[PDB]
Design a protein around this motif. Sequence first.
Motif, mmCIF file in Angstrom:
data_model
loop_
_atom_site.group_PDB
_atom_site.id
_atom_site.type_symbol
_atom_site.label_atom_id
_atom_site.label_comp_id
_atom_site.label_asym_id
_atom_site.label_seq_id
_atom_site.Cartn_x
_atom_site.Cartn_y
_atom_site.Cartn_z
ATOM 1 N N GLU A 263 0.812 -1.210 0.000
ATOM 2 C CA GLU A 263 0.000 0.000 0.000
ATOM 3 C C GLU A 263 0.857 1.276 0.000
ATOM 4 O O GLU A 263 0.459 2.276 -0.589
ATOM 5 N N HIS B 167 1.657 0.551 -8.367
ATOM 6 C CA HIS B 167 2.571 0.482 -7.252
ATOM 7 C C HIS B 167 3.986 0.630 -7.839
ATOM 8 O O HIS B 167 4.371 -0.121 -8.748
ATOM 9 N N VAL C 22 1.895 2.626 -3.532
ATOM 10 C CA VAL C 22 0.918 3.159 -4.473
ATOM 11 C C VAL C 22 1.328 4.577 -4.877
ATOM 12 O O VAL C 22 1.538 5.419 -4.019
ATOM 13 N N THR C 23 1.446 4.827 -6.185
ATOM 14 C CA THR C 23 1.815 6.156 -6.695
ATOM 15 C C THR C 23 0.787 6.751 -7.662
ATOM 16 O O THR C 23 0.858 7.903 -7.956
ATOM 17 N N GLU C 24 -0.167 5.964 -8.135
ATOM 18 C CA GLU C 24 -1.211 6.422 -9.051
ATOM 19 C C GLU C 24 -2.427 5.523 -8.891
ATOM 20 O O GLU C 24 -2.284 4.291 -8.790
ATOM 21 N N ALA C 25 -3.605 6.145 -8.878
ATOM 22 C CA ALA C 25 -4.882 5.440 -8.734
ATOM 23 C C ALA C 25 -5.834 5.972 -9.749
ATOM 24 O O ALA C 25 -5.918 7.192 -9.936
ATOM 25 N N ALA C 26 -6.581 5.073 -10.376
ATOM 26 C CA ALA C 26 -7.668 5.476 -11.282
ATOM 27 C C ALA C 26 -8.746 4.457 -11.032
ATOM 28 O O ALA C 26 -8.475 3.493 -10.299
ATOM 29 N N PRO C 27 -9.967 4.665 -11.575
ATOM 30 C CA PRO C 27 -11.042 3.652 -11.365
ATOM 31 C C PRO C 27 -10.670 2.207 -11.746
ATOM 32 O O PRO C 27 -11.058 1.276 -11.024
ATOM 33 N N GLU C 28 -9.901 2.037 -12.833
ATOM 34 C CA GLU C 28 -9.497 0.710 -13.373
ATOM 35 C C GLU C 28 -8.181 0.143 -12.873
ATOM 36 O O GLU C 28 -7.886 -1.035 -13.093
ATOM 37 N N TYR C 29 -7.341 0.985 -12.306
ATOM 38 C CA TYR C 29 -6.048 0.495 -11.913
ATOM 39 C C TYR C 29 -5.375 1.168 -10.746
ATOM 40 O O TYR C 29 -5.668 2.293 -10.376
ATOM 41 N N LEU C 30 -4.447 0.424 -10.179
ATOM 42 C CA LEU C 30 -3.642 0.888 -9.090
ATOM 43 C C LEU C 30 -2.216 0.654 -9.537
ATOM 44 O O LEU C 30 -1.873 -0.433 -9.973
#
Lengths: 245, 233
Positions: free
Chosen positions: A170, A183, A173-181
């Motif tokens: 956790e 790391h 994690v450097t980028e989050a979008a609805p479809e992807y995470l």
Amino acid sequence: SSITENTSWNKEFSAEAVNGVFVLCKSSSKSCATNNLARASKEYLPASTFKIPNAIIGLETGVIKNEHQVFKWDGKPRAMKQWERDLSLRGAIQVSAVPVFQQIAREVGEVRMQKYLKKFSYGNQNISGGIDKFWEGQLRISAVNQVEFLESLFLNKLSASKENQLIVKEALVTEAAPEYLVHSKTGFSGVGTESNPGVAWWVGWVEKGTEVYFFAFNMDIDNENKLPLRKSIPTKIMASEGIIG
Amino acid sequence: SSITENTSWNKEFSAEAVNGVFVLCKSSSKSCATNNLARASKEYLPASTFKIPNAIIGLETGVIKNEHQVFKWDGKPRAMKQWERDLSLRGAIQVSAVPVFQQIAREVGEVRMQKYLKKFSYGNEGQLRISAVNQVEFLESLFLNKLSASKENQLIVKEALVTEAAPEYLVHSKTGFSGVGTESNPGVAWWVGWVEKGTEVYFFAFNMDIDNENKLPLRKSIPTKIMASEGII
């Protein structure tokens, strides 16, 4: 691992006059692809990408209490203005706080460090030159080894508690979008010389829908202004494959 | 909890002709602020915000095997296109995939579900209602691994809730909306979560009346504006 060399990716490297490799695996390390098979297996100094196993071992040894651990500044100046305050795990990892991690390494100690890295199959295994300075020194790891190691972390197969593996996953994690995470973790050993160059890393994995993509990138670097290429080159390649952009 | 009413955010509601509440807590539920004290304690249908306890209970009881659980589509037509595919836990959470969480709740069973909700102090099925304050309290417990569930399982759900990452912070959040209703009986829209910002943590629960679908975007935008203005995100 199973790895296929595709020369096509070389374009993105040529365009930028970058000497480097990219390794990208879909689902597992039984399915990787690379621009340069030989560079894929060559070992380089991990620099701050070494923060990943360091954090796991820190947590596992109790040196790091839990995910809520704060890394207090002691008042005494730090060599970077970004480290001169209190940091979370994720924060220490994002800014690569050298005194934070050396202190973790010193408290882990050299016998426990070596043992965990052996259990982890983490590179060539050499920690010489001092305990607070071996990611800058003798320890070396390849792109393929990095994806293997990250795959083990993803699947909770490292010799560590599931909890501690989750905590580290956790914090990365450097980028989050609805479809992807996404790391990920950067590394840079320094400029070195023109004749003998420093190395730059971007390593991580992408959870997209039900799929996972493991990745590891490195390049020769002799100028700090080339540094953003360590993210743009892998990002272009992953964009072109329709993964992330 | 300890909750202080403020008039500073009142304009932000009135400018949009919106009836609703925001509750925002720094470090802990011992420092919550709100535009409306009474509405903060008022219980509403959780709608898809319920997917948070559901996911935890799903994992606790082994119905959700672990964080790699694939929720496979059975081929049958579903109420949205974006649900007609295999989904991860994170995937099913982000698109509030009704048939997925219905299957989880079914396999868990009514009595088991109810037992866990009581253990969690989650509100007071279509009968279950929860307040903005109760949301922050429940989320705080989750953040602190204090629920009656393995630390692992709580970790798994915390990560599936990540909706925004930036170098200084991570936002974890969840929407819910029960649908449009009569002016007599208006629907409620929810945004809840927390922000880990450096060493600090902010808990939040928003809800608002909603009789027009076109108003929905305010559910994220108003709390975002309030939190942005305070420098959180």
